[PDB]
Amino acid sequence: MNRQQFIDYAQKKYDTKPDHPWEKFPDYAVFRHSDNDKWYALLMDIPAEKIGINGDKRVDVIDLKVQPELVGSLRKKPGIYPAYHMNKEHWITVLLNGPLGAKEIHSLIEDSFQLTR
């Protein structure tokens, strides 16, 4: 799943419009509820290095909130890394255009959504 397919899925399955809090980073986009304004998804374009993957290349990742007892197990899957720019005990960073399946990603997007309802 890529950057495009992601922002679209959010718009349809949640009717959420992407926000861009950072002026310096036009790409970084957050997804929150209209209720409590709580972020449940953080889309970012970052240097592969910042999350351990090598190669002088950039990557598109999304940060999702999960239950602290699942962070250890999830991070063990391929394509899931430690939370970047977010709290590591509560957040997860999923690599887009990566080995993680869109289905598995959709459910994680749901989990982060309900965890911040």
Terminal CA-CA length for the chain: 24
> What secondary structure does DSSP assign to 20-69, as a single string?
---SS-SS-EEEE-TTT--EEEEEEEEEGGGGT--SS-EEEEEEEE--TT
Q: What is the dotted CATH code of the domain comprising 2-117? A: 3.90.1150.30
Helix (H) or strand (E) holding 3: helix 3-13
* Distance from C-alpha of 63 to C-alpha of 78, rounded to nearest angstrom: 15
Residue type, 16: T
The experimental method behind these coordinates is X-ray
Extract the tokens encoding 70.
């699942």
Strand partners, 42: 30, 63
Crossing angle between the packed helical segments 3-13 and 102-115, to the nearest 10 degrees: 50
Extract the tokens encoding 39.
């972020």
Residue 32 to residues 25, 41, 52, 64, 75, Cα–Cα distance (Å): 18, 7, 27, 11, 23
Strand partners, 39: 32
Residue 26 to residues 9, 18, 34, 72, 78, Cα–Cα distance (Å): 20, 11, 21, 31, 28
Domain assignments of the chain as residue spans, ordered by start? 2-117
Closest listed residue to residue 50, CA positions, set 42, 39, 37, 59:
59
CA dihedral 60, 84, 20, 113 (to 10 degrees): 90
Residue 33, Cβ neighbours under 10 Å: how many?
A: 14
